[PDB]
């Protein structure tokens, strides 16, 4: 309503662009919503999704994750802080996953959309679990355009969380591969900021995080666990008009601590 929505509307008057909220609560079915429908870019939290969809493929080809994946130097694009020392030997999939997650490790990235048929096989796994929103274009680093009025390499606030409910809680993965998912996301690191800074410490919390470099266009979603009680889910996304628009964190982890301290 009208008391949910105001402070979202001031943060991002304070901020200077746009702010997609959704957060779902999997116990109740209470959610809180702020622009959950319009569109915002991915940038890397695409990735996540990316792991996810090896993971599922997984359950269909025995033996993926231990693909060993061989490339060679011109493989290597910009931020692939973990495939560039794994060059002389290979990485298999599913430590490429691990990469992509964790460390939002570009070429990871394209060569796991590679091996699912480039972006169009990502949106395809999308579609496969109900999501008609998600979409990939591109590949890295030619997504993180984030140009005003492009639906490309997109995804709502809304659409991101259901998809991440159905792959983290419900019955789109199986539970080997669920784990592995969970874990990943626990275990991710660039989202301190964002997210995790709206929970309370005790509260275990799952992310991925991206981050576009330009038109003030980052984000976060996340899985919390509060404690003996039903999960949340919840996305975070932001955008801003001007292509040297900084993006902001702090607006994240308050957006985010809005939607959780909103929830019934
Ligand atoms: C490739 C970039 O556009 C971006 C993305 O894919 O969204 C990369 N992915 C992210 C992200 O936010 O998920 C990052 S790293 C992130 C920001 N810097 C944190 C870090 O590790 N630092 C050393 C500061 C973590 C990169 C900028």
Not at 97 to 111: F, G, M, P
Not at 192 to 197: D, G, S
């Amino acid at each position: 309503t009208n008391l949910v929505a105001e402070p979202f509307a001031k943060l991002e008057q304070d901020f200077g662009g746009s702010i997609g909220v959704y957060a779902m609560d999997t116990g109740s079915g209470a959610t809180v919503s702020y622009r959950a429908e319009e569109r915002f870019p991915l940038c890397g939290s695409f990735k996540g999704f990316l792991a996810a969809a090896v993971l599922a493929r997984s359950q269909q080809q025995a033996g993926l994750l231990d693909t060993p994946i061989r490339y060679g130097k011109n493989a290597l694009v910009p931020w692939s802080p973990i495939s560039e020392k794994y060059l002389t030997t290979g990485m298999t999939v599913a430590e490429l996953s691990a990469a992509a997650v964790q460390y939002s490790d570009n070429a990871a990235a394209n060569l796991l959309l590679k091996e699912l048929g480039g972006p169009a096989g990502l949106t395809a796994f999308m579609r496969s679990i109900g999501d008609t929103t998600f979409r990939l274009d591109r590949w890295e680093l030619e997504l993180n355009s984030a140009i005003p009025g492009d639906a490309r390499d997109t995804s709502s606030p809304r659409a991101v969380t259901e998809s991440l409910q159905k792959l983290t809680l419900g019955s789109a993965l199986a539970a080997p591969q669920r784990q592995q998912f969970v874990d990943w996301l626990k275990g991710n690191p660039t989202g301190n900021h964002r997210i995790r800074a709206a929970v309370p410490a005790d509260w275990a919390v799952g992310d991925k995080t991206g981050t576009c470099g330009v038109y003030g266009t980052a984000n976060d979603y996340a899985v919390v666990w509060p404690t003996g009680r039903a999960p949340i889910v919840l996305a975070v996304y932001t955008r801003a008009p001007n292509k040297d628009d900084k993006h902001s964190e702090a607006v994240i982890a308050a957006a985010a601590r809005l939607a959780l301290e909103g929830l019934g």
